[PDB]
RNA sequence: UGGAGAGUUUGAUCCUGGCUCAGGACGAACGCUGGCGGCGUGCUUAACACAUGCAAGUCGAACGGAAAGGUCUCUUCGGAGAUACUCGAGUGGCGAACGGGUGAGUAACACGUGGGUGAUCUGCCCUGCACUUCGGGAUAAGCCUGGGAAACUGGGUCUAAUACCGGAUAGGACCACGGGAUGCAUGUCUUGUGGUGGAAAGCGCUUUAGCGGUGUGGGAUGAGCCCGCGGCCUAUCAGCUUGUUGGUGGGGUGACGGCCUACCAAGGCGACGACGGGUAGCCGGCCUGAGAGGGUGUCCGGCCACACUGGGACUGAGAUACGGCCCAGACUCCUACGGGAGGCAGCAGUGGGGAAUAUUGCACAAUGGGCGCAAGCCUGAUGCAGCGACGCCGCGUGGGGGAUGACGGCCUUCGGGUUGUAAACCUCUUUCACCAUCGACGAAGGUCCGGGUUCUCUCGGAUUGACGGUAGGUGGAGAAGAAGCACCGGCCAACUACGUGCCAGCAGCCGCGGUAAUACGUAGGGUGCGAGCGUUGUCCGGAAUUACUGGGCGUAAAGAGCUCGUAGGUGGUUUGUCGCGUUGUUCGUGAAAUCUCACGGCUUAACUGUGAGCGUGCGGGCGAUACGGGCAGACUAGAGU
């Protein structure tokens, strides 16, 4: 099941513009509701959840989801925290908002979704897909012609584009060169206070 | 009972058992004769008898009325039991 | 008697298979003498193996296959040389 | 590579110390809600009683026979003709001990782990070697009949077989005497001499269609038995044992064995828990935990036990013999009252108990299994399919813009805030659902007919899928059909108003409500989730509140009133040896599945597969002796004289 409603609203809640550009944000920084000007208490548990909160509405992965990843980055060697960012940058909406294919979460998703997409040549319609090393981000061949899929070339100059992924011209498929490790990864969020949450 | 088997298998296991009485009450009987003979210690009839006695027991043991296991631990029984006669 | 049998340890959608040495008054996900194959009947021409020299070892001493084995039995080849069939290569692709 | 705390004893404090809470899990249940798919999963209580259907059958290449089909006929016009493919009823073989269910019983070599069997069995499977040699007599079935209500059964002829019986020869029987090899003692194998002994079978043929059988040596597999270790509560169970402990001679068993028996002696077990009482199927595992632990043994898989209750044998290689037999007992049915039948803890399904868990479906398509030379038949195993959000995973119920920040709602300090880019509106695209259509992999498969040197092989042709016109691809239409649950004083994330006024009521805890309730009911807002959200119950955690890891006993609970002393535990310094503990290495085992790492594929996931760890333990060999332990000593320092 996806949130399905207003995206200022948590902006607000969570104190961090989470997506890109937002004039509805930045007019009322504080948190919505009747009483939303009242003084939060800074519990650590607070900063905590807001925090989750933030890191899972920021790519639109639901709870549990959030959970089994979190409990395989923990099992894989090393650090956990750039692990659960990389899987969560792997997923292939956000693979898209880095090609630049897209101008909201919510339609990079439903571009996925709906499927104009083929990564090795094969009809994927669940956002849920990682990507792997070398892998081929391509669309439909019938998509061309289409409103959105001919402004996504002109709009393709004003996002920087990440150093993890190869983008090419008048066929506009993607090459991913690795996994994106930690630093090209952007960061709205601190990240060790998802850590700390689940040993409670 | 019930399966068409059954009945016809039931039929059978009282064909074996009959049979198989007719040859151990054979055996049964002899081996009595045998500890007739050996009590007595005639020696003449019991020398003589084994030749009947193993015979028999052989012929149990090649249908298969008992085992040959116990065929060979009787026969050494009686073996046994004669060589002190 | 010993049987080479095929046994099922696969999914709803897809039968997977394992082929082992086993007792015939035996259930199928049982206790296997020892592995020596498997056959996958998914792929375009098929997912076979066989290790081709423990079966050579269990067909001498009497380890007969079913029926459905015999014929991959063919396709390995291990029946020919086991027979003295002059089709002894395996003819796998 | 892995460990969180908070509230509560006081006027205040610090300890001690319980209680409560924040987390996770279920074969779950109940409340509300609810779209689908994938994959798992579903009597945890009554091992309570079962209507109804199927779940064990197979061979005409074993034989006597012709009940049906079609034939060579005659010919009544609706009967004869077995000779004849084909085959009803019938005799024999194998199977039925596998397969499936339940967990009552069982505290036990029942189970887990490792060993011994020089103390053993093992049909059909493979391999090595000889033989198929003479015969006999019955009987089914059939036919004529008798009795009985039937269930079933008596009498008289007649006929076979790979059914039965008699034989000849044949070493893996025996006895005795010996060799030759090995030990671990009863003993083991290969032989010789002599005297005894035991086996079988035939069935078909287009004219190189083929099925058999018997005696044995060795494998393979299954099994039997025995043993070390491990695994609940309880002493408010201290004496248990007489075939008990052992021996001899016997019997019996496949096999050792008091397994049984005659005799003889009087032994065996136990405070390291005998005997007894209670509880309980056990396990790989599953839940939890940082681990050690604690709980648990459900799906799967392995082992065991049982099959209405209790007792026993038979056949057969193989028997808790669930859908075999004998008997007793309890329960339901028929009887013509003399007599008989039945056992769903198999697949369903019914009734009954419970809070509660499902279709009286399809296919043998695949695999495993049974039988037949084979085609083929059987398979409620198995593959599936239906129902239950019962659980896990996945995906949707739109997206980008969109202020005059619209109406309405709520609050208000009456200036406004809030719902809120959320809406109206524009614009764009159809994951899922709708209609239409094509359409599967699972089948280098299963049989027939071309060609194949025969075994084999395909050039290459027909036909065969329960799932299922299902999964999946493509076209058409338009945001169009698709969100609810819980909570908001602290733990704990989330607040104002109105209604109520110790009343209703809430609550886990401590507490709230007696006129201004952030804590009851409603509204608004919000938070956490989301086809799920809450309540219960159960278990672990927090609980270092049973403490091995990891606790304590002056006053908080806790030193026996004191001492001696039994078992036990523990033990100074030194020498040499053993190598039991300990420790090193290797070999074997520690099944598969499970958990972890890496890849691979189902659109990702759940799930699966492969390779590597895990399998902590145990057995054998080869090392070591620092420490502990055994032994043989030594010393005086402890101890005693
Ligand atoms: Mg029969
Ligand atoms: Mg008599
Ligand atoms: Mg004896
Ligand atoms: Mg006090
Ligand atoms: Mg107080
Ligand atoms: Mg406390
Ligand atoms: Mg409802
Ligand atoms: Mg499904
Ligand atoms: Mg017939
Ligand atoms: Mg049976
Ligand atoms: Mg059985
Ligand atoms: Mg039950
Ligand atoms: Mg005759
Ligand atoms: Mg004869
Ligand atoms: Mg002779
Ligand atoms: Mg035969
Ligand atoms: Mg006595
Ligand atoms: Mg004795
Ligand atoms: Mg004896
Ligand atoms: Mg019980
Ligand atoms: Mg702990
Ligand atoms: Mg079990
Ligand atoms: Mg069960
Ligand atoms: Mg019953
Ligand atoms: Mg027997
Ligand atoms: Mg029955
Ligand atoms: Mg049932
Ligand atoms: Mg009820
Ligand atoms: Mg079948
Ligand atoms: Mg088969
Ligand atoms: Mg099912
Ligand atoms: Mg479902
Ligand atoms: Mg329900
Ligand atoms: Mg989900
Ligand atoms: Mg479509
Ligand atoms: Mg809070
Ligand atoms: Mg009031
Ligand atoms: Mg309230
Ligand atoms: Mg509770
Ligand atoms: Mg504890
Ligand atoms: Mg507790
Ligand atoms: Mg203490
Ligand atoms: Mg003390
Ligand atoms: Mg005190
Ligand atoms: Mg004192
Ligand atoms: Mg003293
Ligand atoms: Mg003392
Ligand atoms: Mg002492
Ligand atoms: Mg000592
Ligand atoms: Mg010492
Ligand atoms: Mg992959
Ligand atoms: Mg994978
Ligand atoms: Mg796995
Ligand atoms: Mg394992
Ligand atoms: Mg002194």
Request: aromatic share 6%; net charge positive; hydrophobic share 35%.
């Given at each position: 099941?996806?949130?399905?409603?207003?995206?200022?609203?948590?902006?607000?809640?969570?104190?961090?513009?989470?997506?890109?550009?937002?004039?509805?944000?930045?007019?009322?920084?504080?948190?919505?509701?009747?009483?939303?000007?009242?003084?939060?208490?800074?519990?650590?548990?607070?900063?905590?959840?807001?925090?989750?909160?933030?890191?899972?509405?920021?790519?639109?992965?639901?709870?549990?989801?959030?959970?089994?990843?979190?409990?395989?980055?923990?099992?894989?060697?090393?650090?956990?925290?750039?692990?659960?960012?990389?899987?969560?940058?792997?997923?292939?909406?956000?693979?898209?908002?880095?090609?630049?294919?897209?101008?909201?979460?919510?339609?990079?998703?439903?571009?996925?979704?709906?499927?104009?997409?083929?990564?090795?040549?094969?009809?994927?319609?669940?956002?849920?897909?990682?990507?792997?090393?070398?892998?081929?981000?391509?669309?439909?061949?019938?998509?061309?012609?289409?409103?959105?899929?001919?402004?996504?070339?002109?709009?393709?100059?004003?996002?920087?584009?990440?150093?993890?992924?190869?983008?090419?011209?008048?066929?506009?498929?993607?090459?991913?060169?690795?996994?994106?490790?930690?630093?090209?990864?952007?960061?709205?969020?601190?990240?060790?206070?998802?850590?700390?949450?689940?040993?409670? | 009972?019930?399966?068409?088997?059954?009945?016809?298998?039931?039929?059978?296991?009282?064909?074996?058992?009959?049979?198989?009485?007719?040859?151990?009450?054979?055996?049964?009987?002899?081996?009595?004769?045998?500890?007739?003979?050996?009590?007595?210690?005639?020696?003449?009839?019991?020398?003589?008898?084994?030749?009947?006695?193993?015979?028999?027991?052989?012929?149990?043991?090649?249908?298969?009325?008992?085992?040959?296991?116990?065929?060979?631990?009787?026969?050494?029984?009686?073996?046994?039991?004669?060589?002190?006669? | 008697?010993?049987?080479?049998?095929?046994?099922?340890?696969?999914?709803?959608?897809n039968?997977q298979?394992?082929?082992?040495?086993?007792?015939?008054?035996?259930?199928?996900?049982?206790?296997?003498?020892?592995?020596?194959?498997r056959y996958h009947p998914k792929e375009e021409p098929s997912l076979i193996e066989?290790?081709?020299?423990?079966?050579?070892?269990?067909?001498?001493?009497?380890?007969?296959?079913?029926?459905?084995?015999?014929?991959?039995?063919?396709?390995?080849?291990?029946?020919?040389?086991?027979?003295?069939?002059?089709?002894?290569?395996?003819?796998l692709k």
């Amino acid at each position: 099941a996806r949130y399905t409603g207003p995206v200022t609203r948590k902006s607000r809640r969570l104190r961090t513009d989470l997506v890109g550009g937002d004039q509805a944000f930045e007019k009322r920084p504080y948190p919505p509701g009747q009483h939303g000007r009242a003084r939060i208490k800074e519990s650590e548990y607070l900063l905590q959840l807001q925090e989750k909160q933030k890191a899972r509405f920021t790519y639109g992965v639901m709870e549990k989801q959030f959970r089994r990843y979190y409990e395989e980055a923990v099992r894989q060697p090393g650090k956990t925290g750039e692990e659960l960012l990389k899987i969560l940058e792997s997923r292939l909406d956000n693979v898209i908002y880095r090609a630049g294919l897209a101008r909201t979460r919510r339609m990079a998703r439903q571009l996925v979704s709906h499927g104009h997409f083929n990564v090795n040549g094969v009809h994927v319609n669940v956002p849920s897909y990682r990507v792997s090393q070398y892998d081929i981000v391509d669309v439909r061949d019938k998509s061309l012609n289409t409103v959105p899929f001919q402004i996504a070339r002109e709009t393709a100059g004003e996002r920087p584009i990440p150093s993890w992924l190869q983008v090419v011209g008048e066929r506009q498929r993607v090459l991913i060169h690795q996994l994106p490790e930690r630093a090209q990864i952007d960061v709205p969020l601190t990240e060790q206070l998802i850590v700390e949450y689940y040993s409670k | 009972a019930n399966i068409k088997s059954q009945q016809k298998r039931n039929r059978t296991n009282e064909r074996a058992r009959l049979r198989n009485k007719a040859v151990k009450s054979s055996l049964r009987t002899a081996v009595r004769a045998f500890r007739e003979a050996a009590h007595a210690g005639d020696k003449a009839k019991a020398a003589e008898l084994l030749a009947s006695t193993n015979r028999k027991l052989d012929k149990a043991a090649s249908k298969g009325v008992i085992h040959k296991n116990q065929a060979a631990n009787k026969k050494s029984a009686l073996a046994q039991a004669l060589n002190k006669l | 008697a010993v049987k080479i049998k095929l046994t099922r340890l696969g999914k709803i959608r897809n039968p997977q298979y394992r082929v082992a040495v086993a007792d015939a008054r035996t259930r199928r996900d049982g206790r296997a003498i020892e592995v020596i194959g498997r056959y996958h009947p998914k792929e375009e021409p098929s997912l076979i193996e066989i290790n081709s020299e423990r079966a050579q070892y269990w067909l001498s001493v009497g380890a007969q296959p079913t029926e459905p084995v015999l014929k991959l039995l063919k396709i390995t080849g291990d029946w020919q040389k086991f027979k003295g069939l002059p089709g002894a290569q395996g003819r796998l692709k």
